Amino acid sequence: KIMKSEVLRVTHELQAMKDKIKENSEKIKVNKTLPYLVSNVIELLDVDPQRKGKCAVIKTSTRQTYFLPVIGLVDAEKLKPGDLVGVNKDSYLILETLPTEYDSRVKAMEVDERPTEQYSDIGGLDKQIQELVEAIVLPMNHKEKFENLGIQPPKGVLMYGPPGTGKTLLARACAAQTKATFLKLAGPQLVQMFIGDGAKLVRDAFALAKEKAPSIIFIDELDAIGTKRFKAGDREVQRTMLELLNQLDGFQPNTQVKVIAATNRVDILDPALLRSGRLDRKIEFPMPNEEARARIMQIHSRKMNVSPDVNYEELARCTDDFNGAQCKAVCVEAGMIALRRGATELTHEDYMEGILEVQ
Amino acid sequence: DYRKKLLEHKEIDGRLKELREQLKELTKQYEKSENDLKALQSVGQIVGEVLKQLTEEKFIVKATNGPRYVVGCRRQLDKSKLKPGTRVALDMTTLTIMRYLPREVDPLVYNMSHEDPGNVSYSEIGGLSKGCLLYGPPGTGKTLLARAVASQLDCNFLKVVSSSIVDKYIGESARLIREMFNYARDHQPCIIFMDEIDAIGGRRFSEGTSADREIQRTLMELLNQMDGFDTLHRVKMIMATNRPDTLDPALLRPGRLDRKIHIDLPNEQARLDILKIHAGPITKHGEIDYEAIVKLSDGFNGADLRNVCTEAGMFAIRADHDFVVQEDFMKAVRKVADSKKLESK
Amino acid sequence: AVQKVVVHPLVLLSVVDHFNRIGKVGNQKRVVGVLLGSWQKKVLDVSNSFAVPFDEDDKDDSVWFLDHDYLENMYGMFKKVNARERIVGWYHTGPK
Numbered sequence: 001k002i003m004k005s006e007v008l009r010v011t012h013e014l015q016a017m018k019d020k021i022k023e024n025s026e027k028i029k030v031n032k033t034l035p036y037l038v039s040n041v042i043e044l045l046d047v048d049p050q051r052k053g054k055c056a057v058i059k060t061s062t063r064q065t066y067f068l069p070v071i072g073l074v075d076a077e078k079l080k081p082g083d084l085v086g087v088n089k090d091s092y093l094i095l096e097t098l099p100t101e102y103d104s105r106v107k108a109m110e111v112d113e114r115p116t117e118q119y120s121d122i123g124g125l126d127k128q129i130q131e132l133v134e135a136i137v138l139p140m141n142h143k144e145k146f147e148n149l150g151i152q153p154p155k156g157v158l159m160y161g162p163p164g165t166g167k168t169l170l171a172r173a174c175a176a177q178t179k180a181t182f183l184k185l186a187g188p189q190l191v192q193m194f195i196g197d198g199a200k201l202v203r204d205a206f207a208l209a210k211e212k213a214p215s216i217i218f219i220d221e222l223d224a225i226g227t228k229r230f231k232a233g234d235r236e237v238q239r240t241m242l243e244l245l246n247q248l249d250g251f252q253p254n255t256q257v258k259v260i261a262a263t264n265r266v267d268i269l270d271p272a273l274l275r276s277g278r279l280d281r282k283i284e285f286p287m288p289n290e291e292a293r294a295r296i297m298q299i300h301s302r303k304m305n306v307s308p309d310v311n312y313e314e315l316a317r318c319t320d321d322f323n324g325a326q327c328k329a330v331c332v333e334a335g336m337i338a339l340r341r342g343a344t345e346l347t348h349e350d351y352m353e354g355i356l357e358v359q
Numbered sequence: 360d361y362r363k364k365l366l367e368h369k370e371i372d373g374r375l376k377e378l379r380e381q382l383k384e385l386t387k388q389y390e391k392s393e394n395d396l397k398a399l400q401s402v403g404q405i406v407g408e409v410l411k412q413l414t415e416e417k418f419i420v421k422a423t424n425g426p427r428y429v430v431g432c433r434r435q436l437d438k439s440k441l442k443p444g445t446r447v448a449l450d451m452t453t454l455t456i457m458r459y460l461p462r463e464v465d466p467l468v469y470n471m472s473h474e475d476p477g478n479v480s481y482s483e484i485g486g487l488s489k490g491c492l493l494y495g496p497p498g499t500g501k502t503l504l505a506r507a508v509a510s511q512l513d514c515n516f517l518k519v520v521s522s523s524i525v526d527k528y529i530g531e532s533a534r535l536i537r538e539m540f541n542y543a544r545d546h547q548p549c550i551i552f553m554d555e556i557d558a559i560g561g562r563r564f565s566e567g568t569s570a571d572r573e574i575q576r577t578l579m580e581l582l583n584q585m586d587g588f589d590t591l592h593r594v595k596m597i598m599a600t601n602r603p604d605t606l607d608p609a610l611l612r613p614g615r616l617d618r619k620i621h622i623d624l625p626n627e628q629a630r631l632d633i634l635k636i637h638a639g640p641i642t643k644h645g646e647i648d649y650e651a652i653v654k655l656s657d658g659f660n661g662a663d664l665r666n667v668c669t670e671a672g673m674f675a676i677r678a679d680h681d682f683v684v685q686e687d688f689m690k691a692v693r694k695v696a697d698s699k700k701l702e703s704k
Numbered sequence: 705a706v707q708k709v710v711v712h713p714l715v716l717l718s719v720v721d722h723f724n725r726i727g728k729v730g731n732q733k734r735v736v737g738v739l740l741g742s743w744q745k746k747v748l749d750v751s752n753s754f755a756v757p758f759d760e761d762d763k764d765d766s767v768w769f770l771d772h773d774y775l776e777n778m779y780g781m782f783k784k785v786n787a788r789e790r791i792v793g794w795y796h797t798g799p800k
Contacts, residue, residue: 004372007379014382017389024393024784044463055460065423067404067448067460073395074388081468091402138676148681149672150640195527230561232570235525238558242522249502249554250518252475271601272555274499276666282702397787 032095035086037061041094042081043070058092066092077211099211106204110184117173122166122324123295128283129170132157135281136178139258140214152255156248156278159262160223161285164323166296167262171218180257181215183208187225190240191233198240206247209257216260223263226270241270248277288324290316297327304335306346315351322359330354403451406460409443420449430454473516480507483636485661486629489591492616494603495557497703498623500633500661501599505552514548521555530573536580543594554599560607578607585615624661627653637665641672643683651689659696667695709748715739718753719797733760734798738775740782741792751789754778 040059046069047053055069070079072086072094084100087093101107119133139146139153146152159167175182185205190198209217226241227234248254254277261279273279288296294312319327333354338346407420407428416432418441430449432441433456440447446460484504493501509516519539526532543549561567563575585591598616600606610616624630630653638649656664671691675683715737722735736758741750756774761767779791 001368001372004375007375010379011382014386017386021389021392024396043468044461046458046461048458055458057460063424065406067406067457069401071395071399073392088402093399093402095399134673134677138673142676145676145681147640148642149676149683151669151672151676154666228558230571231527235570236527239522239525242520242555242558246520246522250475250506271557274663275502276662280663280666400788 031088032086035096036089037087038084038100039087039092040081040083041085041097043079056094068092068094070094072097099207103200106201107208109189110182112182112184114179115172115176115182117169118176119173121173121296121299122170123299124288124292128285129174131281131283132159132174133177136174136216140178140180152276153258154276154280155254155258156273156275157258157260157281158273158279158283159260159285160266160282161264162287162323163264164325165285165287166324166328167264167285168218168220169325171260171262175216175218178216181213183215183217185217185219187219187221187223190225190237198237199243202240202244202247205259209259212257215257217257218260218262220262221264222261223265223268226263226273227268228270242272245272245278249275251277287321290319293319293322293324293327296324297331300328301331301334301346304331304338304346305344307348310348314348318352318355322355326359329358333358404457405449405451406446407449408446412441412443415441418443420447420454422449428454430456432456470517473518475506475510475516477507477510481511483507485624485633485636486626486631489585489594490596490598490615490617492606492611492619493597493599493622494606494619495601496603496621496623497658498621498660499663501622502554503662504622505554505597505599509550509552513550515546515550517543517549518552518554521553521559524559524574524577526573530569530576532573532577533580536577536584540584540594547593549594551594551596552599553596555601556598557600557602557605560600560605560610562605562607578610581610586612622661624656624659624664630656633661633664634668637668641668641683642681643685643688646685648685652685652692655689655693656696659699663699667692667699670695706746706748709741709750711750712752715750715753715795718755722755722797734758734796736770736794736796738778738791739793739795740789742789743792748792750792753795754782 042057044057046055058066078097082099084098086096225237334350407422410421412418419429421427440459446462448460484507524532559574561571671688674691675687737755740753741748756771759769
């Protein structure tokens with residue numbers, strides 16, 4: 001062991017390095033304390049002919065352009081044309097880069113932490129919603145098993161069906177089970193007055209989904225803008241829409257946060273929406289029958305003082321060709337006039353009274 | 360007694376030599392921290408532009424902010440890059456010149472930055488042994504092939520999206536056909552991809568409106584630059600689409616689309632090969648039988664065959680079993696594939 | 705390797721300080737100073753320097769007294785205030 005006796009000197013040199021890094025690593029707090037302003041960064045690779053070529057183009061908020069190479073600490077998500085970077089008074093070096101927003105009108109579209117309703121609020125849809133509950137639970141907790149089996153969850157699920165069925169409050173009810181950040185987005189929001197806004201909205205959606213923590217982005221009314229016209233505004237929505245499909249087709253690292261979509265009608269079906277990353281999960285959600293409407297209306301009305309003498313035959317007969325949110329409006333209306341009816345207990349005539357009231 | 364002390368001392372020496380790797384690896388990063396701290400000391404540089412040069416040693420610079428200045432020549436650099444018309448950089452002190460600043464553009468960063476890695480994808484396309492037509496029979500994977508060679512070399516990443524010929528304003532897209540195809544004629548190597556051409560492939564059977572007439576006019580520029588007065592012997596275009604019925608029979612002339620590659624799974628060896636490359640990282644019971652999966656599958660989609668096989672892995676993971684028997688493969692590829700036949704209209 | 709060097713008068717005026725801070729003791733031997741410069745480029749450029757207490761013996765010439773802690777502390781603090789210059793060599797004021 002005489003040859004291994006020199007390792008002690010090496011360990012003393014290494015622990016001496018750990019003893020001497022406290023000062024030069026301690027000045028990181030006083031030099032990198034606070035970037036006083038915000039400056040935009042534009043990446044531009046240079047060539048010096050080590051003597052290697054590496055540079056970047058800087059633009060300050062006060063419209064002043066300077067010169068500086070690519071510097072700082074170990075960069076992994078950096079080197080992109082972003083904003084909100086670290087900068088000193090006049091040295092103009094890059095110390096702390098963090099991606100920034102602005103145009104808060106799109107950043108704060110729907111800031112929801114978690115909803116209140118859960119999946120146990122409906123009745124008679126487990127045979128078709130269980131695939132989605134699995135498709136949101138197993139890709140969140142069973143990421144370890146995805147390497148033994150080599151499974152990548154799909155990113156596009158088509159939640160299509162007739163309107164009024166509750167395709168938004170139910171997907172939100174499953175978003176309560178996702179436990180991730182919920183972020184809504186409307187179809188018509190892409191149609192703006194200025195040019196090129198849809199690119200900023202799409203790259204913003206993948207900017208918060210790509211940059212932020214694992215979240216949930218549910219969109220709706222996609223059919224209202226998914227028109228395949230052959231000037232035209234829906235062809236501009238083909239520029240933005242086909243741009244989004246290009247970001248769901250040309251991006252293999254799209255294994256991150258999913259993009260859930262829902263269409264209120266499948267009349268104008270875009271044929272280019274078929275792909276593993278695109279809307280491949282096509283589970284048909286038809287109009288609930290009087291039995292299913294009595295189930296979702298019973299579980300949605302399990303909180304009000306409902307009379308126990310309900311055979312569901314009269315309401316089952318009156319509810320003809322109705323939807324889920326329509327019976328939800330009947331439940332809410334019953335909870336509205338049942339107050340002014342004097343009797344604190346919900347009666348049986350209030351069902352048809354609400355059906356003929358709002359419809 | 361003596362023979363055991365050599366092995367025991369070899370074990371003490373082993374656990375003594377197995378602790379250096381936990382420090383000597385991160386000490387390189389710790390020293391790299393101070394290397395960067397010594398690399399961030401070059402600060403205070405500004406930019407400028409050169410318009411007119413009077414003296415060979417000292418010339419006039421034009422700053423971005425608007426005020427103009429005059430600078431000298433540094434003893435290190437030479438008069439090669441000092442010629443006018445090249446954007447350079449300056450310093451706040453003495454207005455010296457460290458190096459120049461090569462110009463660029465905004466979309467040029469997008470056209471010169473996207474790169475897709477992966478060299479095995481060229482050999483993962485399955486048993487598949489001036490323009491190419493990739494049409495849309497019941498079989499997919501054209502994006503995996505075009506992006507497989509494109510991910511292999513492609514010599515560039517000149518991707519042409521079918522949504523880039525929108526031209527919201529007056530339909531003068533000829534500046535973009537001649538601009539981009541003029542870039543293809545300028546750069547000696549060039550490969551062009553045209554994915555989802557069915558949207559811009561209107562058959563103009565009836566009287567088209569102003570929105571259709573401009574797209575068909577861009578198709579007239581395509582005619583005038585494919586079989587007009589301009590050859591395309593060196594450049595190559597890849598027309599990908601979805602339905603082989605509305606593919607502009609005027610453009611279906613064999614002068615442009617020489618061969619036809621039907622993206623399908625006809626051969627048993629191609630379906631078995633793609634099934635094996637998609638069945639790489641999957642684990643399953645020792646009982647293997649792929650001839651039933653390949654035999655029962657008739658005219659299906661490749662990437663959707665991956666989605667059906669992984670869908671059978673989800674059907675098998677519903678019962679949270681680590682091992683996966685091939686019964687759920689035959690019955691889940693069977694039933695789910697029959698659902699794809701139902702949704703194959 | 706190195707064709708020419710560049711020496712600033714600041715180090716020689718620091719030798720004037722070597723002759724100033726003597727204190728009239730009667731030794732005036734070859735006080736050795738720690739020369740600093742830029743060894744990165746092919747040409748050598750001395751910017752500043754410092755000194756270390758150096759004493760020899762009267763009869764025996766092989767006696768020489770240097771310091772490692774003072775060199776690592778003055779060089780450590782000097783590198784902390786200015787990291788663009790590092791150790792290169794030394795120099796003595798003796799004519800022989």
